[PDB]
Amino acid sequence: IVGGYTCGANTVPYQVSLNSGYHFCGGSLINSQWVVSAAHCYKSGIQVRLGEDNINVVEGNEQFISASKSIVHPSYNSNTLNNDIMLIKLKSAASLNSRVASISLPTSCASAGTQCLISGWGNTKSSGTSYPDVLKCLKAPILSDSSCKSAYPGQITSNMFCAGYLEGGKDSCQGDSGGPVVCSGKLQGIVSWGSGCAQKNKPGVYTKVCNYVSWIKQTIASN
Numbered sequence: 668i669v670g671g672y673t674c675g676a677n678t679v680p681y682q683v684s685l686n687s688g689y690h691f692c693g694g695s696l697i698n699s700q701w702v703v704s705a706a707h708c709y710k711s712g713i714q715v716r717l718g719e720d721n722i723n724v725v726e727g728n729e730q731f732i733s734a735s736k737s738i739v740h741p742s743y744n745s746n747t748l749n750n751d752i753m754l755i756k757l758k759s760a761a762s763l764n765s766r767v768a769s770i771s772l773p774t775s776c777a778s779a780g781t782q783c784l785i786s787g788w789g790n791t792k793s794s795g796t797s798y799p800d801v802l803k804c805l806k807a808p809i810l811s812d813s814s815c816k817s818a819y820p821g822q823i824t825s826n827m828f829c830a831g832y833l834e835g836g837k838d839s840c841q842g843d844s845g846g847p848v849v850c851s852g853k854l855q856g857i858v859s860w861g862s863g864c865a866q867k868n869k870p871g872v873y874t875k876v877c878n879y880v881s882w883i884k885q886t887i888a889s890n
């Protein structure tokens with residue numbers, strides 16, 4: 668996250684870190700046994716780390732649970748990043764508490780102008796590299812479809828939306844991928860892509876989660 672703020676320990680209780688020896692992507696806990704992340708975050712050998720603040724210190728609220736199965740969306744396209752979403756099942760159910768909690772799935776899509784909370788352990792510089800140890804947060808609005816398509820001609824599908832600031836300075840970034848965009852208490856987006864980070868006229872592009880709720884529910888029901 669570029670141009671955000673330190674969230675506070677365990678204030679984003681659905682935020683997960685995907686670990687393969689090191690943090691490499693975010694995710695969102697959606698029930699005791701399932702995490703939603705970005706398909707471009709796929710790899711084998713994932714350990715899900717719940718209850719994190721400092722990803723480099725054991726602080727006492729963590730739960731570390733191996734993935735038993737990963738499911739990339741059937742129509743994910745890694746060239747266009749259309750359908751950039753994946754489900755991870757945990758080998759065991761998380762113990763849910765005030766600091767490890769699921770985030771509600773949307774029943775309706777969000778609209779341009781709605782404020783949202785975006786979070787992660789990604790890069791904090793736009794012309795630089797600096798990775799934080801504690802979780803960073805950004806409040807950002809959803810942008811109109813037309814301004815999104817105008818910023819990124821020929822690239823925005825119906826499964827994407829833009830959020831952030833066209834002036835630049837405030838965005839998600841490398842290492843935030845897969846993590847949450849939560850608006851009025853609902854998981855509306857997944858950190859997906861963008862040209863650089865926090866560049867003028869290049870807002871963040873996010874997977875439109877409301878399009879996938881039927882897929883998520885039926886997948887969970889059969890797995």
Ligand SMILES: [Ca+2]
Pocket residue numbers: 719720721722723724725726729
């Ligand atoms: Ca920790």
